[PDB]
Write a protein that binds this ligand. Structure first.
Ligand SMILES: Cc1cn([C@H]2C[C@H](O)[C@@H](COP(=O)(O)O)O2)c(=O)[nH]c1=O
Ligand SMILES: Cc1cn([C@H]2C[C@H](O)[C@@H](COP(=O)(O)O)O2)c(=O)[nH]c1=O
Ligand SMILES: Cc1cn([C@H]2C[C@H](O)[C@@H](COP(=O)(O)O)O2)c(=O)[nH]c1=O
Lengths: 149, 149, 149
């Protein structure tokens, strides 16, 4: 069975103009784009996005870094929630494995280019926060027979 | 002291049209193309290719996935049998390291893009199965002095 | 706090004509080019560079391999000394992780494409040996707000 994960290119990904490169990494595995939207993230939606960190001293700083243009995305694939995390790499780019997004593009955790859901529960919540159901698109990849066993 | 390994692009590599990208990964290390042939794999040759799994319940499914166009290849280099295995990554793409072929391109073991010999004995057997001696080409890379110590 | 490291493309990197690819890997992380110079390495400068190995039987062959065009470089970034070492990978390419320069381009330690400082002390020593201070340039990257936290 496939699943869907929420991936969001942060303002540093937009401003460094690596959006296409990021998308290509997920397309390369035959992951399907199920939703995609450019918006400007605001403090009120980011408070909900970062709800697990309510009341923590670092939350204002997380929100400030994220206040800016973002690319909201939903990708579909086998085990894609865990696999996208593996592809992003460790929170700290300096600890991330070579070949991951954060190791290949970044230096510090506060500017680590991309967010991805950390669990099935978070993916469901995040997809619902940033997308309406009518924005989630269902279609089948023509190469499905050569992607899925 | 170089050796030769058998590498085969499976039908999913052909149909997803990533043959050139795969070849480029091996050329990038200064591995030498010693043989290359496009064919359509037959059940008869695949039964011998997969002889280790004779009688196993999953063998018919393995053969069915592989009955299609394939690119047979022989690459030469230092430690190239083990090194090509490392470059392909784990059989299951989800367990493969970022930066390997299977992690970068694939989702499931049954569609994992590429075969490579797993040992010196297997390489000798597989090269002999898929190639005639007259198809194996001997020449020296002009950059040899800058590739080999 | 950023630091600076000495990175040198060896004659195999020049002759295999992958200079631009190497530079792009470091630029991709927002590391700043603080110095860059093409020269031809000579035995007298290489003897100082490899001073720790004076008298060892492998040194004459090492110096022979390194007598040729080289690209001297200084890159600046957070933790860049350790990070550049990680990006190069193990001295022996066969042991280097997928996604590192040496794993992606090389076969043997004697032709492993690139040198990088192993410590802050070595970086200071190597930058003094290979560059004049006139050659180290001070300027700020315009994307700093999106590279550094
Ligand atoms: C941006 C950032 C996030 N994180 C943590 C906060 C969340 O628990 C997790 C995912 O954050 P993210 O949604 O901003 O990618 O990473 C840090 O520890 N340091 C940072 O600098
Ligand atoms: C295709 C496939 C191969 N394998 C095993 C069978 C062989 O022992 C080994 C290499 O197979 P391969 O020649 O098809 O790459 O991988 C699996 O365990 N699962 C799979 O889905
Ligand atoms: C080129 C080379 C370097 N080295 C060691 C010597 C130095 O301690 C370290 C870095 O050397 P380098 O300046 O040539 O990169 O690598 C080997 O052990 N084997 C080799 O073939």
């Amino acid at each position: 069975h496939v699943e869907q994960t929420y991936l969001m290119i942060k303002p540093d990904g937009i401003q460094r103009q690596v959006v296409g490169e990021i998308i290509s990494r997920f397309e390369k595995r035959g992951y399907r784009i199920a939703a995609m939207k450019l918006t400007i993230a605001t403090p009120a939606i980011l408070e909900e996005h970062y709800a697990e960190h309510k009341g923590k001293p670092f939350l204002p700083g997380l929100i400030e870094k994220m206040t800016g243009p973002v690319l909201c995305m939903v990708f579909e694939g086998v085990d894609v929630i865990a696999q996208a995390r593996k592809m992003m790499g460790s929170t700290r780019p300096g600890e991330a494995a070579p070949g991951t997004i954060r190791a290949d593009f970044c230096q510090q955790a506060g500017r680590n280019l991309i967010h991805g859901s950390d669990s099935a529960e978070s993916a469901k919540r995040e997809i619902s926060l940033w997308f309406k159901p009518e924005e989630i698109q269902s279609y089948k990849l023509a190469l499905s027979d050569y992607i899925f066993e």
